[PDB]
Design a protein around this ligand. Structure first.
Ligand SMILES: Nc1ncnc2c1ncn2[C@@H]1O[C@H](COP(=O)(O)OP(=O)(O)O)[C@@H](O)[C@H]1O
Ligand SMILES: Nc1ncnc2c1ncn2[C@@H]1O[C@H](COP(=O)(O)OP(=O)(O)O)[C@@H](O)[C@H]1O
Ligand SMILES: C[C@H](N)[C@@H](CCCCCC(=O)O)NC(=O)O
Ligand SMILES: C[C@H](N)[C@@H](CCCCCC(=O)O)NC(=O)O
Ligand SMILES: [Ca+2]
Ligand SMILES: [Ca+2]
Lengths: 224, 224
């Protein structure tokens, strides 16, 4: 299977919206797709247990019919850092379980997108961060950049750190979290010059419900 | 002179509020102080030229009576990245001018705090970032962390990058940009464990005008 990890310059920059666009483009290319969010925090109660909205977005944008727990094995109700609520609840986030879940999806899918939680260094325990697991698995990384004042600094910090870990930065996606602003073109040119990987596409500001929108057309999958 | 550079996990995290607290503590320790913001964007028109509010905060919190241009040689009206507006206006930001200004302050002050613009990697031209100048000058670095969801990742990214440049991270300051939230203690414990430098103090949420507030008491200067 082709496998990619998606990270962001921060929490709430559109990692989930961009992952749905990537999944839609891959399905259009003919792949059997699966989205995987191994850890999620910020979830609602239902008859079946807790359900996270970002994991549900990945489940319904995958081409295969997948069970919720296969897409998201670790679901926490409170929207905070996973290591805090894991410790509070007495439910360890185990590296072996996260890796087993990825293998289980590779039995049915040939294109798997793994979405992180928060940015690059989100702690999963007191001695283990999400970056440690990505390094262990040697996953190529796609960076989602929310375009806003302050994003050049956060895009360059994340790019340098991935490269120093010896991982491949496969590309980046620009996501327009706000309406058209005055220096949008100049920000796009600087980010293109400075991030050492191809720009895969730009998702526009979409007021109504951008997880459900047909956004695959904004990604050029040939660059991955 | 003692010289320190202050950076932040992002723009608008309280770098200026924390710099005024540091300057107030240094004056209380008996130093002849000077604040220096060599580049500033986001400024008002006056009879005397453009004036930036953060540079004015540093000027009035310094113990010496200083002229505005000595505190801030490069003033731009628009609140954007300095390299965009520098190019637009035809006014180059020169490394030699920024360094000369620092030397000029060292003639009168024995404790100088240099405040950056934005975060670590803010571009000053198409081939030069603020980090390049800090490295050239070999300044020790103080990191200001705005405590909010997403700050663990941004604090760890900035810490790693400074250390890989061979610079010293002298310490960090926690700044409470919002009211007391549910996981404040746990965030403080994680940040203390993960940032490899001493916590110099914590500035509380101060609704009214925290640049003018007496905040020196929140910094323990003995750790610097
Ligand atoms: N392109 C966009 N247009 C409009 N709103 C967006 C866009 N991208 C993200 N948003 C909104 O920003 C919020 C965070 O997006 P999300 O993908 O969940 O972020 P993340 O996975 O990085 O935490 C959501 O409410 C989402 O609808
Ligand atoms: N501790 C605080 N309490 C209340 N407001 C704060 C605090 N720190 C920062 N702010 C507010 O946040 C905004 C940004 O602060 P500022 O120091 O100018 O940031 P920066 O130098 O990082 O760009 C200002 O409006 C400021 O009043
Ligand atoms: C306007 C802001 N306050 C700040 C500049 C932020 C530049 C952000 C660059 C980036 O996108 O990383 N300017 C300043 O500190 O004077
Ligand atoms: C609640 C957020 N959306 C996110 C967790 C953010 C953790 C932030 C850690 C940090 O401070 O860097 N969870 C998630 O992606 O499922
Ligand atoms: Ca979300
Ligand atoms: Ca300010």
């Amino acid at each position: 299977s082709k496998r990619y990890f998606v990270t962001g310059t921060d929490t709430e920059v559109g990692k989930t919206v961009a992952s749905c666009a990537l999944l839609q483009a891959a399905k259009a290319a003919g792949y059997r797709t699966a989205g995987y969010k191994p850890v999620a925090s910020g979830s609602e109660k239902t008859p079946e247990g807790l359900r996270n909205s970002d994991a549900l977005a990945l489940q319904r944008n995958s081409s295969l019919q997948l069970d919720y727990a296969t897409v998201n094995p670790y679901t926490f109700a409170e929207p905070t850092s996973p290591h805090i609520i894991s410790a509070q609840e007495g439910r360890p986030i185990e590296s072996l379980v996260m890796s087993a879940g990825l293998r289980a999806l590779e039995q049915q899918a040939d294109w798997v997108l793994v979405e992180g939680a928060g940015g690059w260094f989100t702690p999963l325990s007191d001695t283990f961060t999400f970056a440690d697991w990505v390094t262990q698995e040697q996953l190529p990384v796609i960076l989602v950049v929310g375009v806003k004042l302050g994003c050049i600094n956060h895009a360059m910090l994340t790019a340098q750190v991935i490269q120093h870990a010896g991982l491949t930065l496969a590309g980046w996606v620009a996501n327009d979290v706000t309406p058209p602003g005055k220096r949008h073109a100049e920000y796009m040119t600087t980010l293109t010059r400075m991030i050492p990987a191809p720009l895969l596409g730009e998702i526009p500001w979409l007021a109504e419900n951008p997880e459900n929108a047909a956004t695959g057309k904004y990604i050029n999958l040939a660059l991955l």
